[PDB]
Design a protein around this nucleic acid. Structure first.
Ligand SMILES: Nc1nc(=O)c2ncn([C@H]3C[C@H](N)[C@@H](COP(=O)(O)OP(=O)(O)OP(=O)(O)O)O3)c2[nH]1
Ligand SMILES: [Ca+2]
Length: 579
DNA sequence: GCGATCAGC
DNA sequence: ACGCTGATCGC
């Protein structure tokens, strides 16, 4: 139906200085994945190229790497990384339809060209699922079917760039796309392709020692329960605890008794088996997710793991990290924190450098709410979690433990994000009147925060959405829902999204600024990971002293707020030691 | 596949 | 009955 040239060779008219480009990678994980076809649409026509002809053509490779030849794409990071695995550099991406649709409305869940095209009543293209299938039936179709699908995707991108840019302009988001998300996409592509080196011998020895400790705790549980059972079975466990041992039923799920960690903590005074259960799960969590699961995805020839940072997924603008998730490696408990000893620099005599913001979301809140007391607190560089811990667990600053501060952090962030007296009472194991009066005291000390809570909800009802500092957007249609519970969830999103999202905006700009400074200084230091408010790098030891001065300054100066931004930093021979 | 659960931010 | 995620597991 749609006309195009099924090209046997690369011609000069395929290499214009503006074009829609499709470099199709069907496998969900695009690391070291096959490129199944290429399509180009420009002023001269529409073209399909087999990858073996295009990617071995010296003129096509040069065109791909020429920053002055502008390309419009969908999910350009997927193409850039897959091309890096083919030894080919992609430059000149000036428009990414995936990131443009994400900024316009993250709730659409746009994951292919067809979904983005439907936002502008363009339907001359099929969904990728319709072409490739699902599950064990997923397959690359016959070449004429594949070629037309890629051509139609490129033609869609070619037609949709201007209407998408027009609406982004109206939303004050065109700079958010062109100067933040698209430059970040190339940085993430470099981070993903570089990967993180894994000490595979240390990890396997940890796995062997962990299997022995799992057996000891497992036998102890059976000894305490009288019999043997599947401890990981939600049914069988609830039978032992709440039917055989007759422990109180504090909480139910849609499927039966709840055995979540908070419930098990409250059942500790009744039977010592529940503390062994918690220890068992924590060991099994490390074994299944952070030892076995990590070894599954290590590339054996390089001992590197290559995560994928999903840049167009979260509703607040944060990133997510998949296969493996390198944003939830344990750190709170020492037994789990040792996992980070297996994350090592990719070269000898290099080191891991870690730098994280201190209380960025509360500092963002102070700036946005213009709360006099909260701004004064951060202008003094007060540790507000520690101050809250002093005020919760009635001690002084020298007596605050890591656990008390860990718990005070959830109260500081819980309160500002609409925790109820019920939720606060359940978290601190205190009476509900006491939690209600603590929340009341909090908002009397910070009345500007309370005003912002009320104002941002009214702003959301009037405009239909909320925004971040760099004009990210999230629509909240449920904010005017007649169902109280549905409306309450939307109101807490209006409270939280501008703050979490602004913190995501700030660290994203910090990564762009940092990347530019690193190249300016001609340093070998490069980014490895982002963990929401935290940047992880590796570099030669000869660069550590310069990095200690460069990285915190870049992160602290990414934006200028009414309060200072504060960055802590550490380095060491492993990720574990970088703290 | 989903809901529970738990690791992080 | 604070927010945002992803992986694993048993059902
Ligand atoms: N609703 C909500 N509940 C939370 O329990 C919670 N936890 C962390 N976050 C957000 C706010 C932090 N600003 C940001 C960095 O998460 P982070 O752990 O580093 O918090 P913070 O910097 O203050 O403590 P720190 O000084 O030891 O570094 O992630 C949360 N939001
Ligand atoms: Ca932090």
């Amino acid at each position: 139906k749609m006309a195009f040239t099924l090209a046997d060779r690369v011609t000069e008219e395929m290499l214009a200085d503006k074009a829609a480009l499709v470099v199709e990678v069907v496998e969900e994980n695009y690391h070291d994945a096959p490129i199944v076809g290429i399509a180009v649409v420009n002023e001269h026509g529409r073209f399909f190229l087999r990858p073996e002809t295009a990617l071995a053509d010296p003129q096509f490779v040069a065109w791909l790497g020429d920053e002055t030849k502008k390309k419009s794409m969908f999910d350009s990071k997927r193409a850039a990384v897959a091309l890096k695995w083919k030894g080919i550099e992609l430059c000149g991406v000036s428009f990414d339809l995936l990131l443009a649709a994400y900024l316009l409305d993250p709730a659409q869940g746009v994951d292919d060209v067809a979904a983005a095209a439907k936002m502008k009543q363009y339907e001359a293209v099929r969904p990728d699922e319709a072409v490739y299938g699902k599950g064990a039936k997923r397959a690359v179709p016959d070449e004429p079917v594949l070629a037309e699908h890629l051509v139609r995707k490129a033609a869609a991108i070619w037609e949709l760039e201007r209407p998408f840019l027009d609406e982004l302009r109206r939303n004050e988001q065109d700079r958010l796309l062109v100067e933040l998300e698209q430059p970040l996409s190339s940085i993430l592509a470099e981070m993903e392709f570089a990967g993180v080196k894994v000490d595979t011998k240390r990890l396997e020895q940890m796995g062997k020692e962990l299997a022995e400790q799992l057996g000891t705790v497992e036998q102890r549980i059976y000894e305490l329960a009288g019999q043997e059972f599947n401890i990981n079975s939600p049914k069988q466990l609830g039978v032992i605890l709440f039917e055989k041992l007759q422990l109180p039923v504090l909480k139910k799920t849609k499927t039966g008794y709840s055995t979540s960690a908070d419930v098990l903590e409250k059942l500790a005074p009744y039977h010592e088996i529940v503390e062994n259960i918690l220890h068992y799960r924590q060991l099994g969590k490390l074994q299944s997710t952070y030892i076995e699961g990590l070894l599954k995805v290590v590339r054996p020839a390089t001992k590197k793991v290559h995560t994928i940072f999903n840049q167009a997924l979260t509703q607040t603008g944060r990133l997510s990290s998949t296969e493996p998730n390198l944003q939830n490696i344990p750190i709170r408990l020492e037994e789990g924190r040792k996992i980070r000893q297996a994350f090592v620099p990719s070269e000898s005599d290099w080191l891991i450098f870690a730098a994280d913001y201190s209380q960025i979301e509360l500092r963002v809140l102070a700036h946005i709410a213009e709360d006099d007391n909260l701004m004064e607190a951060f202008r003094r560089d007060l540790d507000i979690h520690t101050k809250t811990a002093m005020d919760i667990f009635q001690v002084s600053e020298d007596e605050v433990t890591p656990n008390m501060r860990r718990q005070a952090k959830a109260v500081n962030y819980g309160i500002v994000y609409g925790i109820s007296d019920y939720g606060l009472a359940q978290n601190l194991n205190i009476s509900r009147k006491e939690a209600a009066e603590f929340i009341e005291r909090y908002f009397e000390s910070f009345p500007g925060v309370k005003r912002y809570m009320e104002n941002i909800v009214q702003e959301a009802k009037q405009k239909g959405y909320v925004t971040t500092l760099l004009h990210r957007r999230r629509y909240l249609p449920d904010i005017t829902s007649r169902n109280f519970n549905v409306r309450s969830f939307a109101e807490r999103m209006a409270m939280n999204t501008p703050i979490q999202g602004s913190a995501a905006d700030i660290i994203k700009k910090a990564m762009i600024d940092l990347n530019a400074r690193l190249k300016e200084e001609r340093l070998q230091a490069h980014l490895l990971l982002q963990v929401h408010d935290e940047l992880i790098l590796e570099a030669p030891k000869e660069e550590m002293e310069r990095l200690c001065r460069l990285v915190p300054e870049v992160m602290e100066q990414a934006v200028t707020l009414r309060v200072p931004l504060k960055v802590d930093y550490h380095y060491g021979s492993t990720w574990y030691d970088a703290k």
